[PDB]
């Protein structure tokens, strides 16, 4: 054999490396995250992250593992239809009686954002439809219309876990 290989190449039997590669890949694989149970169709929730944080919205469905689908009220608070990680929602005990016909999908609300969407607002037939459903449940009720307009504010004088929602 030629002298370059009889010396340098000798360091390692490299045919073994695939077995190492598998074991390493396994170890640095992510842990699983649990899908929650506590949310029911038509629950009001408060948004905790991203461009829409602080507003009340209504939960519609599970979508794609941890992803969930929500609607604001384009007339009442200007928020349309969007998707978000189901952990970025705070639950509250109010439940509206809405039921929907079919599945729908929308843009995700990422945690890191650069700029606000002050303009360029339009609506689809389904956005119109779903608003014109939600609105019926809201109109008949005393202060509910105004409730959706004021942002949420955490109490700065007591421990959070003492409060109920």
């Amino acid at each position: 054999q030629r002298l370059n290989i009889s010396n340098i190449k000798n360091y390692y039997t490299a045919d073994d490396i695939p077995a190492f590669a598998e074991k390493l890949l396994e170890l640095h694989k992510p842990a699983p995250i649990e899908l929650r149970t506590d949310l029911v169709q038509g629950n009001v929730v408060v948004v905790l992250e991203g461009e829409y944080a602080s507003y009340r919205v209504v939960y519609l469905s599970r979508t794609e593992d941890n992803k969930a689908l929500c609607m604001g009220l384009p007339s009442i608070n200007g928020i349309g239809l969007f998707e978000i990680d189901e952990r970025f929602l705070l639950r509250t005990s109010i439940v509206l009686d809405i039921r929907l016909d079919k599945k729908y999908r929308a843009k995700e609300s990422k945690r890191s954002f650069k700029k606000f969407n002050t303009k360029e607002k339009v609506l689809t037939k389904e956005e119109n439809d779903i608003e014109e459903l939600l609105l019926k449940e809201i109109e008949n009720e005393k202060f509910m219309k105004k409730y959706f307009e004021t942002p949420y504010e955490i109490n700065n004088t007591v421990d959070f876990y003492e409060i109920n929602h």
């Binding site: 992510p30 842990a31 995250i33 905790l48 992250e49 952990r87 606000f116 955490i154 959070f160 876990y161």
Partner: protein
């Protein structure tokens, strides 16, 4: 101005705390972990309810990265302080600064 808005958004939704030390003995420091106090939490039993929650350090004057994320790992002592871990080690210049506690849990891998 986006900074003024990003602050008000965070202020309305998070609990507040301050960074005060690294984990240390009398002689040595362990800068991978930091110690935090939370506003109205004052016993170890009260503090246990925050273990697992996300934390964020926001710094608008920074040229590199506007915020650092982390997680609360454990309670520390008997008067309601906690220990946390971040995606990068906290500088001694950043001690005394304000930290935000985010009201949802995350996994140790996400940071």
């Amino acid at each position: 101005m986006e900074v003024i808005k990003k602050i008000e958004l965070k202020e309305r939704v998070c609990a507040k705390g301050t960074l005060y030390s690294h984990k240390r003995s009398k002689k040595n420091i362990y800068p991978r972990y930091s110690l935090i106090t939370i506003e109205n939490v004052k016993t170890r039993e009260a503090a246990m309810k925050y273990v697992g929650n996300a934390v964020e350090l926001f710094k608008p004057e920074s040229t590199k990265e506007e915020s650092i994320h982390g997680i609360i790992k454990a309670v520390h002592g008997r008067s309601g302080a906690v220990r946390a871990k971040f995606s990068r080690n906290i500088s001694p210049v950043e001690m005394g600064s304000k930290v935000y506690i985010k009201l949802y849990k995350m996994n140790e891998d996400e940071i």
